[PDB]
Design a protein around this ligand. Sequence first.
Ligand SMILES: Cc1cc(-c2ccccc2C(=O)Nc2cnn(C)c2)cnc1F
Lengths: 156, 39
Amino acid sequence: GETTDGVYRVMTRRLLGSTQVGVGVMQEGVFHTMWHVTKGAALRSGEGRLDPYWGDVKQDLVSYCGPWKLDAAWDGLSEVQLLAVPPGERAKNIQTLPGIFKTKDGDIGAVALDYPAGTSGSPILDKCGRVIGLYGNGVVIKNGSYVSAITQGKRE
Amino acid sequence: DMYIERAGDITWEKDAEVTGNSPRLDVALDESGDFSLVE
Ligand SMILES: Cc1cc(-c2ccccc2C(=O)Nc2cnn(C)c2)cnc1F
């Protein structure tokens, strides 16, 4: 299968036509996405198979072919870019200053950008182009819009 | 049966659409990985 670093769409044919269920990151030969996109199922890349390696429903993250590789963190200060890959539309950078999710276990960066659910797993970047987490796990607010955590895993 | 398709390089892009606000929200995370608003 294709193993070049970059951003990828996650597709299915189990519905009408070809439907985009979400997005992920290929880095150092490991595929990174959100748990709710694949539910831990195997993936095809051309005639190649990608098997799940690590996952956690609570973090809503999963890695394929290896351990989680992405370890960069939001600085807490600077704007970031969502590399949005929406269904049927070209990859597009959107630059934004994250807000904060305040939880009993700590503060997390959050991005207030509204995209279809099939955009889940798009990477959030810092100014050096490092993936600081994935978009698509968050909350619907007073206004009716979606606010996503910046969800990052840990690298062992 | 799910398959992947490359969509781009991961690159910062100088002068991209700048949008979105920066809300501070009290949230809870449940064992199913669902965030919810505390109030
Ligand atoms: C109509 C609609 C869209 C979304 C949504 C919007 C942007 C990114 C991701 C999601 C999303 O679906 N997240 C998500 C987490 N866990 N599960 C199972 C699903 C959220 N709620 C909705 F009603």
